[PDB]
């Protein structure tokens, strides 16, 4: 049993390992989305920058979980991170919709992870999830929903172009 | 169902809406208290400033709840904010006592709101309440209790005058 | 009779108290409008910021009246501030239209309040209303009319999006 | 019943008082460890500085609990803080091992304290423990485990000397 | 016999160890006093700050003795530091009176410790006590006496409140 | 055929896509290595930092390839990035050895990729590989070889500890 290990159950440890993979998968999806919008026939640099930052955030999410795994004395077990479910992400609206779905799936997995720590009485892990993940997920999800609304509002073509310039830096 | 909505129950949404009204009511009470102490026959500017700041805090509390309501995909439903239960707030000690009672009622409503999010497994909402409201309520309640003790200590007249100058900026 | 009281009639005092409530109601409406545009399915942050500032202005209007009430030796009597007449404010154009109607109703109430001070020979109150309220109302009303014209000009969709970005900070 | 007291159970109050003593005991242990490594026949100044800082941290932990006790309207009841269980702490590795054991015992007591606040529905206290104690305990425990690993890695003699210089400031 | 040991008698070493405990006990008393005045039904923040600083001073006194013990080649032997003789410290005047009594008891113990070093011809220890403890004790005792006089002068209630603000930062 | 596409053969495009995956795999390996050395029973922070930076470099390598893919009008096709071939990386020497092997495999794949661009007369791609990848690979490989030599030189235990401190920041 590892030296730091205390109130840290195997199922909590395993859940963090699955969440790590999921965070890495999200990072991969955003990375795919970013360079999708960098395609010359897409060429939306706001979306490219936005998803690249999103990708880096998910990388941070994964690594913070790996860091946390080690903090608690769990052992990081990495899995294949699957290629994202699409190669092309449609319009800015489609990608933002796909991002919302992605973030909601990550959020659900985080809430499921919280339930694991909750049922195991892992008080520290629960607060770690709450403070470091659940809040950001809620912010991200609201933010992406806002983007989806605006991408619907502005419409295709010039609207999507303007959204790229005005809603994303 | 709204785009961000996830693990966000209707009763949690409704509880936030009641809490919004309660925060607005507290803001209104403090506002009333502030201008009560600005009456020429009261004329305690520390108390005026103190309750004005308290009022602005409660406004922030309400708006942070409205913001949070939207973040989770709830729909803000506003109600009449009732006029405060008094028009005149007695002495500084009386107002501080009334403020304590007010903050404890807000605190209880927040704890009741936490129970709603708790029973609904709303992990994010619980941490939002804890981090953003429960801690401040506990600080505020301790702080007002301290003020009440000192207002009792100093007594009426010059004591209340000195408290106004020395305990409130 | 309060110490400052001089050339300050009961009807002027009562009119200020009604105006306070009206200013608070306007503050509430703008607050509702602000968080309406913060809804994920509205998501117009310029409108959110704009109405939040408008809301804070009306709060200032109310408090300046409460302050003034006390200055003249009147007694602030607070009433329920009613919930705004809508929960949802339609489009940016609709909200701006509703804001115009609101500001014109506040303006009329202010002009009615001026008539009260006028008929009571309350020279100071009249100038207070003129300098501190009537001018701003006229500026606000012109400004909102301009916004309404531009929101009509730009049309729904991308136009409303662009207006949000370009006419509101 | 004290003025701030609200949702603050006697068993939570009593648990904080025991935890205060435990934090003070940990502060005492670290203090003992610090001056142990300041012995001329030990003379490891990194370990001295490290445990002195650790000691001050535990003092802060105790005082933050006393502060919190008062915030909630509990009454601090102090007990004898027992002398640490050793007068001499062996090698740097031994002291670090003893520190790990100490921090894990404090951590368990904190987790037990959380369970008390949890079972009493003390939502604020739980978040206070989580935010202010459980996270730091997890960081500390991981950090001490790392130190123990490195002290094992470097071995006695020069290794312990180098660890003192390179892993502790 | 330890390497630094020279003109350092066992009774001097033992006296330093008792004085360490006494300094720690004083630190504990002041700590108790500090958070006593932080009670919501006491709420004197000057007294809280004052005794917290006093507490930290006694901690420094203890540690300087532990440091000195090691400097001379003595071995620090820690004992239980007893809980302070009261849980509640009465009025500011009572606490200041109790502090005077405490400091005079510490001072007497220091003078007794000086006699031990004196009779053992421990010239360095005597000067260490004189320079580092006896002078501060005399300053502290005079200072606390002054406070007691002023707390008597100002009386209960507002006087104690004013003393808290004006004589203690 | 994409708008930028010119002198950009399908096999060059496909080779970049495989190299992207390989760069991502290397990034994953380094990430695994980094948090391996962050294990409490490994606890080598230089190695953790070193491999984290290495990981970020490989991420940059992958993304620069994705960017380049798009620049030439190729289409990024992502694949599963496989979990690294080990979960635990042994000693610092073992990890550095594994890193060398990894970098040499990436280097060979890059040289194979260069041959593809070479045989296709892709003059720009060749120079892109040379300037942006081959040089860094050669620097990295030399640098890791140096580290391996020094990790062999210093030996296990304190040596590995010292290497962690002195050869890695
Ligand atoms: Fe994530
Ligand atoms: Fe995200
Ligand atoms: Fe929490
Ligand atoms: Fe509030
Ligand atoms: Fe409050
Ligand atoms: Fe107004
Ligand atoms: Fe207005
Ligand atoms: Fe502690
Ligand atoms: Fe600790
Ligand atoms: Fe002392
Ligand atoms: Fe003293
Ligand atoms: Fe002398
Ligand atoms: Fe690479
Ligand atoms: Fe490399």
mmCIF file of N, CA and C in Angstrom, chain A residues 142 145-150 153-155 158-159 162-168, chain C residues 37-45 156-162 164-166:
data_model
loop_
_atom_site.group_PDB
_atom_site.id
_atom_site.type_symbol
_atom_site.label_atom_id
_atom_site.label_comp_id
_atom_site.label_asym_id
_atom_site.label_seq_id
_atom_site.Cartn_x
_atom_site.Cartn_y
_atom_site.Cartn_z
ATOM 1 N N UNK A 142 -22.006 26.240 -19.814
ATOM 2 C CA UNK A 142 -22.746 27.480 -20.036
ATOM 3 C C UNK A 142 -22.129 28.274 -21.170
ATOM 4 N N UNK A 145 -22.830 26.635 -24.511
ATOM 5 C CA UNK A 145 -24.239 26.845 -24.834
ATOM 6 C C UNK A 145 -24.460 28.244 -25.384
ATOM 7 N N UNK A 146 -23.868 29.245 -24.726
ATOM 8 C CA UNK A 146 -23.938 30.616 -25.216
ATOM 9 C C UNK A 146 -23.423 30.699 -26.640
ATOM 10 N N UNK A 147 -22.255 30.099 -26.889
ATOM 11 C CA UNK A 147 -21.696 30.092 -28.234
ATOM 12 C C UNK A 147 -22.649 29.439 -29.218
ATOM 13 N N UNK A 148 -23.222 28.285 -28.846
ATOM 14 C CA UNK A 148 -24.153 27.607 -29.737
ATOM 15 C C UNK A 148 -25.327 28.514 -30.046
ATOM 16 N N UNK A 149 -25.866 29.184 -29.025
ATOM 17 C CA UNK A 149 -26.969 30.102 -29.276
ATOM 18 C C UNK A 149 -26.557 31.177 -30.263
ATOM 19 N N UNK A 150 -25.363 31.739 -30.081
ATOM 20 C CA UNK A 150 -24.944 32.833 -30.939
ATOM 21 C C UNK A 150 -24.626 32.335 -32.335
ATOM 22 N N UNK A 153 -27.761 32.136 -33.825
ATOM 23 C CA UNK A 153 -28.258 33.482 -34.059
ATOM 24 C C UNK A 153 -27.673 34.063 -35.337
ATOM 25 N N UNK A 154 -26.356 33.945 -35.509
ATOM 26 C CA UNK A 154 -25.677 34.637 -36.600
ATOM 27 C C UNK A 154 -25.838 33.921 -37.929
ATOM 28 N N UNK A 155 -26.104 32.626 -37.910
ATOM 29 C CA UNK A 155 -26.307 31.903 -39.141
ATOM 30 C C UNK A 155 -25.005 31.587 -39.836
ATOM 31 N N UNK A 158 -21.385 34.759 -43.373
ATOM 32 C CA UNK A 158 -20.821 35.928 -42.702
ATOM 33 C C UNK A 158 -21.047 35.863 -41.202
ATOM 34 N N UNK A 159 -22.208 35.364 -40.787
ATOM 35 C CA UNK A 159 -22.474 35.250 -39.366
ATOM 36 C C UNK A 159 -21.437 34.401 -38.663
ATOM 37 N N UNK A 162 -18.281 36.337 -38.559
ATOM 38 C CA UNK A 162 -18.295 37.361 -37.520
ATOM 39 C C UNK A 162 -18.191 36.745 -36.139
ATOM 40 N N UNK A 163 -18.890 35.632 -35.904
ATOM 41 C CA UNK A 163 -18.777 34.982 -34.605
ATOM 42 C C UNK A 163 -17.337 34.605 -34.329
ATOM 43 N N UNK A 164 -16.667 34.033 -35.335
ATOM 44 C CA UNK A 164 -15.266 33.660 -35.195
ATOM 45 C C UNK A 164 -14.415 34.842 -34.751
ATOM 46 N N UNK A 165 -14.718 36.040 -35.266
ATOM 47 C CA UNK A 165 -13.920 37.224 -34.963
ATOM 48 C C UNK A 165 -14.314 37.852 -33.635
ATOM 49 N N UNK A 166 -15.606 37.860 -33.316
ATOM 50 C CA UNK A 166 -16.115 38.669 -32.218
ATOM 51 C C UNK A 166 -16.381 37.884 -30.944
ATOM 52 N N UNK A 167 -16.759 36.619 -31.043
ATOM 53 C CA UNK A 167 -16.999 35.848 -29.833
ATOM 54 C C UNK A 167 -15.782 35.052 -29.388
ATOM 55 N N UNK A 168 -14.768 34.903 -30.248
ATOM 56 C CA UNK A 168 -13.565 34.128 -29.939
ATOM 57 C C UNK A 168 -12.312 34.968 -30.228
ATOM 58 N N UNK C 37 -30.684 38.259 -20.812
ATOM 59 C CA UNK C 37 -29.739 38.165 -21.913
ATOM 60 C C UNK C 37 -28.525 37.331 -21.567
ATOM 61 N N UNK C 38 -28.371 36.982 -20.298
ATOM 62 C CA UNK C 38 -27.380 36.022 -19.866
ATOM 63 C C UNK C 38 -27.889 34.586 -19.952
ATOM 64 N N UNK C 39 -29.160 34.383 -20.272
ATOM 65 C CA UNK C 39 -29.628 33.025 -20.501
ATOM 66 C C UNK C 39 -28.828 32.395 -21.632
ATOM 67 N N UNK C 40 -28.538 31.103 -21.492
ATOM 68 C CA UNK C 40 -27.751 30.415 -22.508
ATOM 69 C C UNK C 40 -28.438 30.420 -23.860
ATOM 70 N N UNK C 41 -29.765 30.469 -23.879
ATOM 71 C CA UNK C 41 -30.514 30.530 -25.124
ATOM 72 C C UNK C 41 -30.783 31.959 -25.542
ATOM 73 N N UNK C 42 -30.156 32.920 -24.872
ATOM 74 C CA UNK C 42 -30.193 34.305 -25.320
ATOM 75 C C UNK C 42 -28.747 34.718 -25.568
ATOM 76 N N UNK C 43 -27.943 34.703 -24.506
ATOM 77 C CA UNK C 43 -26.490 34.797 -24.606
ATOM 78 C C UNK C 43 -26.052 36.031 -25.392
ATOM 79 N N UNK C 44 -26.575 37.183 -25.005
ATOM 80 C CA UNK C 44 -26.077 38.419 -25.588
ATOM 81 C C UNK C 44 -25.364 39.194 -24.488
ATOM 82 N N UNK C 45 -24.036 39.111 -24.401
ATOM 83 C CA UNK C 45 -23.345 39.697 -23.241
ATOM 84 C C UNK C 45 -23.325 41.212 -23.240
ATOM 85 N N UNK C 156 -32.775 40.877 -37.091
ATOM 86 C CA UNK C 156 -32.554 39.753 -36.211
ATOM 87 C C UNK C 156 -31.265 39.040 -36.591
ATOM 88 N N UNK C 157 -30.887 38.078 -35.763
ATOM 89 C CA UNK C 157 -29.784 37.213 -36.134
ATOM 90 C C UNK C 157 -28.460 37.938 -36.014
ATOM 91 N N UNK C 158 -27.671 37.883 -37.089
ATOM 92 C CA UNK C 158 -26.338 38.480 -37.073
ATOM 93 C C UNK C 158 -26.400 39.956 -36.721
ATOM 94 N N UNK C 159 -27.424 40.650 -37.211
ATOM 95 C CA UNK C 159 -27.555 42.058 -36.890
ATOM 96 C C UNK C 159 -27.631 42.293 -35.397
ATOM 97 N N UNK C 160 -28.511 41.558 -34.724
ATOM 98 C CA UNK C 160 -28.622 41.673 -33.277
ATOM 99 C C UNK C 160 -27.307 41.302 -32.607
ATOM 100 N N UNK C 161 -26.647 40.281 -33.135
ATOM 101 C CA UNK C 161 -25.338 39.900 -32.632
ATOM 102 C C UNK C 161 -24.342 41.044 -32.781
ATOM 103 N N UNK C 162 -24.271 41.636 -33.982
ATOM 104 C CA UNK C 162 -23.349 42.742 -34.212
ATOM 105 C C UNK C 162 -23.695 43.937 -33.345
ATOM 106 N N UNK C 164 -25.040 43.889 -30.427
ATOM 107 C CA UNK C 164 -24.563 43.538 -29.097
ATOM 108 C C UNK C 164 -23.078 43.831 -28.939
ATOM 109 N N UNK C 165 -22.292 43.586 -29.994
ATOM 110 C CA UNK C 165 -20.845 43.764 -29.924
ATOM 111 C C UNK C 165 -20.438 45.214 -30.137
ATOM 112 N N UNK C 166 -21.121 45.920 -31.036
ATOM 113 C CA UNK C 166 -20.647 47.212 -31.510
ATOM 114 C C UNK C 166 -21.346 48.400 -30.873
#
